Paper text:
As it was not sterically possible for these states to coexist in the same molecule, we used a masked three-dimensional (3D) classification to separate the data into three maps, representing the three binding modes. AA and TG maps also suffered from orientation bias and low number of particles; however, the density was sufficiently clear to allow unambiguous compound modelling. We believe the coordination provided by the triazole might additionally stabilize the bound state.
During the catalytic cycle, a GyrB-coordinated magnesium ion is required to cleave a phosphodiester bond in each DNA strand, with DNA 5′ ends temporarily attached to the catalytic tyrosine residues of GyrA (Tyr122 in E. coli).
Residue numbers in the entry:
A (entry chain A), B (entry chain C): 8 to 524
C (entry chain D), D (entry chain B): 405 to 806
Write the structure that this text describes.
Amino acid sequence: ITPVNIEEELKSSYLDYAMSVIVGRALPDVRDGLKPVHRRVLYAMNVLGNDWNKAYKKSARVVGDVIGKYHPHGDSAVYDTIVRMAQPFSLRYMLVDGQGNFGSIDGDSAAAMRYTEIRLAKIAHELMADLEKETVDFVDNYDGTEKIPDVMPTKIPNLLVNGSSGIAVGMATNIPPHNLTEVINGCLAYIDDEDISIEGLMEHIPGPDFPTAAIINGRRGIEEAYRTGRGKVYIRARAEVEVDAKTGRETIIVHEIPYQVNKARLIEKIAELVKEKRVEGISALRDESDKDGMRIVIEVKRDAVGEVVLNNLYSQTQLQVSFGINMVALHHGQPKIMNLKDIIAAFVRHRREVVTRRTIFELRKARDRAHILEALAVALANIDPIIELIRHAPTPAEAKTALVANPWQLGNVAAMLERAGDDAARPEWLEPEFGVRDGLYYLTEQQAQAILDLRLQKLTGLEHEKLLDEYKELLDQIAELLRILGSADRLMEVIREELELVREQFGDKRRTEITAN
Amino acid sequence: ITPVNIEEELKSSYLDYAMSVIVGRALPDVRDGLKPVHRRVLYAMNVLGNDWNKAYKKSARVVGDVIGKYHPHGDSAVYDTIVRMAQPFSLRYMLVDGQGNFGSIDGDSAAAMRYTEIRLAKIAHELMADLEKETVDFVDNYDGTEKIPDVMPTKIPNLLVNGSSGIAVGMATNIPPHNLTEVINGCLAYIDDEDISIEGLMEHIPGPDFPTAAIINGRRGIEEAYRTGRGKVYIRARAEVEVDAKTGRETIIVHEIPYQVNKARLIEKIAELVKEKRVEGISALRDESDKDGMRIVIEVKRDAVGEVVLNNLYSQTQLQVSFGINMVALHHGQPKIMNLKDIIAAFVRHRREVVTRRTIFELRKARDRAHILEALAVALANIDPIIELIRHAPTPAEAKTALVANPWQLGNVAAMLERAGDDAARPEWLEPEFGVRDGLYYLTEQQAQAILDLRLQKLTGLEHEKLLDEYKELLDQIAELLRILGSADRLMEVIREELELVREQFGDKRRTEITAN
Amino acid sequence: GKLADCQERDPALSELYLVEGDSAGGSAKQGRNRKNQAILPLKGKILNVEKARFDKMLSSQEVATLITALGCGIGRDEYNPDKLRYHSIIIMTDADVDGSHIRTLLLTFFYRQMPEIVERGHVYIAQPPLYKVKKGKQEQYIKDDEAMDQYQISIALDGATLHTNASAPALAGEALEKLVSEYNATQKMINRMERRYPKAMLKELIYQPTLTEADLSDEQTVTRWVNALVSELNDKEQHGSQWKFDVHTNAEQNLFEPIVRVRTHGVDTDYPLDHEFITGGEYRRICTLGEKLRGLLEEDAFIERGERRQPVASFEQALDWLVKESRRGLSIQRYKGLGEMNPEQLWETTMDPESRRMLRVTVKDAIAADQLFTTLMGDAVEPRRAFIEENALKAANIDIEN
Amino acid sequence: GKLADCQERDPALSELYLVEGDSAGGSAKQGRNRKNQAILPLKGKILNVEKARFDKMLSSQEVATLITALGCGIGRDEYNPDKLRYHSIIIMTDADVDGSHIRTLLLTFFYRQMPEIVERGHVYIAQPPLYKVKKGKQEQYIKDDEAMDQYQISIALDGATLHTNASAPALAGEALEKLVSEYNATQKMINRMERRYPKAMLKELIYQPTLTEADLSDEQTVTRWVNALVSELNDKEQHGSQWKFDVHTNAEQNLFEPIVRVRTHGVDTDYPLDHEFITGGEYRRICTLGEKLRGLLEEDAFIERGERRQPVASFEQALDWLVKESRRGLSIQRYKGLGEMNPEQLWETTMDPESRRMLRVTVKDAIAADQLFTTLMGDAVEPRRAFIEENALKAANIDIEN
DNA sequence: GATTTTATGCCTGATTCT
DNA sequence: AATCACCCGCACAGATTT
DNA sequence: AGAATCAGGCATAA
DNA sequence: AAATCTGTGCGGGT
Ligand SMILES: CC(C)Oc1c(NC(=O)c2ccc(NC(=O)[C@H](Cc3c[nH]nn3)NC(=O)c3ccc(NC(=O)c4ccc(C#N)cc4)cn3)cn2)ccc(C(=O)Nc2ccc(C(=O)O)cc2)c1O
Ligand SMILES: [Mg+2]
Ligand SMILES: [Mg+2]
């Protein structure tokens, strides 16, 4: 037993909880716009080899793997997170391809884990591109047994296109979806000029674009949101009044509803309103949506005008909603309020870093392969002494030592060995003792071991020439990689080409319409 | 709206259900005494490589794999089946080594799939011995995508050793456990003489042997059950009366209980019986069973007699139970009532078939390997002409055709072939055109391809001698395999040696004691 | 409690469904015409009223809920079929053995407790699909295994597949289709006689010439016939078994039989092609197919699949190649149960009035049905065992094979 | 109501436990001392009485059950702390952030509704362990990460570890242990300030000598130090880094502006060093440690490890090898929560009266506690945001350098 | 992570009819 | 086989008191 | 007084 | 008749 003040305990405990929640659950990372749970689920699915053109897997398998290996929390949260990513009416671009009963726009329900199946989507492989080439940092899991990426090497601007929504202790975040083609055009515009103003950026990005294709009634909140990071917009449904003459009948047909609105609750609320005499002029209400489109039919009395009741419905029920844009994201492990230009700059810097690291890795691999091929080509030109030495030796170790002991004359292949750019095709870790010396070649241990593993099939002409062709190709590849690493302008051209390819592959049309008041 | 008679629908549906339950759910197979669920669970565990000397695995993983791949049924049944096999007080010889909470004799229940762990036992690997040598037939699973064994190549008499219990439509089966050494001695006695009567077999197999080590009362029921296949036996608990002089008051101590009896229910039933004055002379009841062993203490009244009160407990309480032996099993895909001799004969026939198939597979593999070794030795004998011809080869196909269309000199290796003559090692499918004809070897297509895949590392002396050693030992192996199939007595000698080895490895002592009335 | 009622009040346009499993019921509740359709999920197996007593039947919850939902009474002097809600009733159980068992239990309950309901024809049985096939654009549902086989056969011979014998003939459809159907029928006939004779013996007889027992008599040509058969069997043997022949002249027509030693290490005494086998119609149709299945293929031949070509030397090889090539861009899904289907699929397969398919239950005879119900569902083990044994594999040996 | 009361009725020797979750509650019920201990599991997070109205408090099931179990009244004119039950109360929540949040909620409830109970000292907080260590025979439990680090450091230098530098010196215990502890303290000091500078620069400055500001001059003295540092940094790289430098003068002192670049075309453009950095005490202690940490190893050097001799340089690798040797026969387990612990472990770790460890809650000041509770648990977001931001990592960036 | 009551056959003990 | 009953921040009707 | 009837337990499946 | 008060839902966690 030892006394302790209540104030210190309360302060320390609550500060620990708040700091854990702020940077552990709620806010997303600016570079890729994914919470830790999304990243862990995607990595777990990637490791199992659950690609987009293979058979499905049960949700229980993925959930159990994630819980056991990476994510030490309950299963209901993980399963709900998985279910949310597979709904066409929640994300602009779905990241999981599901099969089963994943729910509908009415907010009905979702089947349990043992009655559904999932796999990765085609676009989801773009986020995890070049993951194996040492392009991102890995960190330990909760028990120092596994490794998880610190951030995905994303190629899609996920944060803007898919949006986000989260609640933390003392702050929150809410960002709506956008259109991919517009964002890519904005990024290309920014790359050409870093001093672009917000007005210039808004020419390529008029505004949000929800999955449900509602109507945005206003244009003043979008500018404020993109200029300061906080704003407010209004989303209105799509409806019209059609008259069939005869007895002057009027009927209201509703096609498209706002974002994040349940149809069943809307219908029940309208029924309750007309029942309690709070809205006059409505006769009957019906739903007729089946597999082809959304249609809600409202009949009005013969002694009323459709426009007044329609405006009353807009003002009273949930057909018109308000959406408060509030952008908060993690920059370097701290929350921060951002605007469009900061997000674009962060994405561009992330891409530059990823491309540079990938280039370095590829250069290293190419140099190692060329180093091995040089030894094989040099060995192939001295067949008779090599076979005599191997036959005379009693043991492979003695043959290896005998091969390493003496230098070997280059022969007729000296034309191409000296044609390289001095030390361009030479590994950095190799000592100056070995390599192409003055008129003779010196072998290492690994080169001798590689020579001992050569097959008799390589003595043919075609196999002999293929090695020389591969070496010649590798020289050009190394030269190209060095040129890419040299200047700072080739990197921008590569980034532009990648962005253009992504835009061509995954582009689509706009849905939401924007009009003035 | 086609019509259908009620009688036809009822008949077809009920007959289909009855046949499926009879031949797929309840009765075991006579050859290995495993229901389909047990076989599928063991096969699924074997495929994952969950051996008996490796790390444990979660129960949920194995259960999910079994459900998804082979067994199209629920999770609770499979998990209960796995749990029952890991309990030391349910099976005589456990088939699954478990870690966690798998219940207790008192009446507790095991934990969920999420917390327990399991792996294969040492004895279980004997049931699946020589599974990969084409010893048993395979059949398709429900969706025609996987293969499952039709019956395991068991090496243990599992049916008699572990017993069985099952309820089918129109019939049921119930067989108690036995001791391994006694059953193996009976099998050897049957092998020595095939006309042994039931009385001769009962010399080596006195009777059942339960895991709980109770007492068996009577001897007529066991003999009747073995002779005909139906019988009844009495299982009595082990208890004693002890007195320490001094006060002159004795107490009843119970150490053991019958098979399939709960301790808590027995104690509560005794308490209820003594509450209602239905048993006289009992003062106090206590249970001191913990860790060290089982002990139930009953302190009698001062004027009571230990024998009189003790005899009433057997008559009223559940310290004595009746077990009904009824042997039913599948012989050739139909139910039948068996006795001891039929089971032993079926096991012996199964062993003979398995050994024959294994020998055939081994002989084929040995001949196929020797065929390639001959070509490699011949090629190494004449290495210099071979490389000289290969060097002028435009492509590998031309080299292969040149090698095929030319005889080669045997050289100094021909003497070895004098030991390999008599067409003993030639493959059956090989034609008489190839091979040695007049002291000049003729190569085939596959032999030439194997020659082209020769590494320089094998040009050393040690590698050259290793091939000759391999060929020399393969000749002796082929000779032994031929001699095994050339006679019938050698098969029985091999079977006897295997049974003796199994008895030595997995022998144990007897538990239950048999006494007359 | 666990009953989604409909809005229609007139008891002549409503319907009731008895879905198996809670997940299937929950899925079906979403995908239904809410105006005049009701749902009533069943958690699992229900009480058997044939063996149970009246008090226990009233004590249970599932049967009590069903009785309350139907609206009629129970027992004599209270039962009144006129006061019936949900004039149309559909079962719609799973497509496995447990589904059939639950269907039999429900039929027993309805027949024993409410005979008039079954007699008037207010009971229906649904037929949900089993397979789903997609080929990029076409998508369809297939029931059971027979229709899947027919669909596979039709897809195999869907365009192209112009078989070439020597240079470039063209069977072109109907002839090839008839040949394939005959071959499949003969293989199906052969598959149902594996117990009596080996598969290889039946397989080899089709290619060899007809025995011609009419002109055989005692010319001793049967010896060469059986010798050639044994040599052909042993030529491509790959299981270690050996074959021999035995002949004799017990009658005017010489008799012969093969002896086979197989992997089991036991030797069968004979598999005689006796008088019955040669006179049987099975061998006659085998020879009829073999007459068209002789060495028709010449030295050069191939199968002309669409924008593809491959040389072949056997009919089975051509069939296998065509089947494998037809399964390139074909995707297949198999439903393990009703819980694997989303509400739209259930609606368009079983609950849509304009595209669903059902069976109506009717009674032909009363005494026979009563006897069958008493025999099967009664609490007498021995009559049920005898009935099951009578219709066992002993009665399955149908000699028609057609 | 999930309350397993004890046998003792005297309200001066009873105890009550408020366990988190259901599995932990079951384990505690299994492993408790039934004589004078009671259990009361909590399913999840409970009502926040600071924000909730008085009427809603009595409606909630969890707080109502807690109030009924305690036995005292609630609200003015009915609260009566004299008629108390369970004079000792223990919280015993999980060892993660959710456990701390639940602890704060329970403390808020107890302080707001029953101040006298907290004042008299009837509220205790348990402290279950986190790590378990086994070494064959010597096994134990370890609480918190700092204790684990201390245990690992002690085991690393548990006997032996005689560092032979040149011919035969011997630190012999205390010297080596003190040096290692001071090095670890300096490493922690570097880690807390790791954000503002690269790791390589701070790790290399310790090996360099003092800045020597006395002989500093605009030319021929300022450049040599920075050039030597850059040369020492450049030849030890594995990520393609590059270090460049420049210096300037402002009529007061000669300031350095070193620059570094790695895997980026951008450049920070400044890592300035001036009089402020050298005047700081962090550099003073770094130089103090580096005076001892020099190239003392000669051509021959080794450590006299038990049945091991590893003659190498770069003493960091020697420390890593020593840590590897220590962990050769060591096993460590990390409990995920109270559910993992079996009943015996729970009994002997926190519930044993003669081996448990707990904390007693007391109040120092009243107004400060009330203001803190209102600021944190109140329904005003701006003061809470300001308080969280004020005590963020900026407050943790303490420039005491000691 | 904790949440119902049925089918199928053979044996027992306890209670209920004649 | 999905449901229990709360914590965190933000915006907006319908309902009480000034 | 002795047949007849009614519960509960056991192991794989909804 | 202007100003407080009182609920509901969005998405990751016991
Ligand atoms: C079975 C499945 C779930 O998962 C697996 C598992 N499982 C695990 O590996 C596992 C999962 C969780 C734990 N957890 C813990 O040990 C800790 C201990 C503890 C104690 N205290 N704190 N923590 N518990 C928790 O973290 C925790 C979290 C949340 C909790 N409560 C709530 O949220 C909650 C509370 C209150 C209310 C209210 N009002 C509501 C909610 C409580 N506890 C350990 N192991 C394993 C394998 C599989 C698998 O591979 N299956 C599979 C493969 C292939 C196939 C095929 O062929 O199709 C099919 C299937 C699987 O699916
Ligand atoms: Mg099923
Ligand atoms: Mg926890």
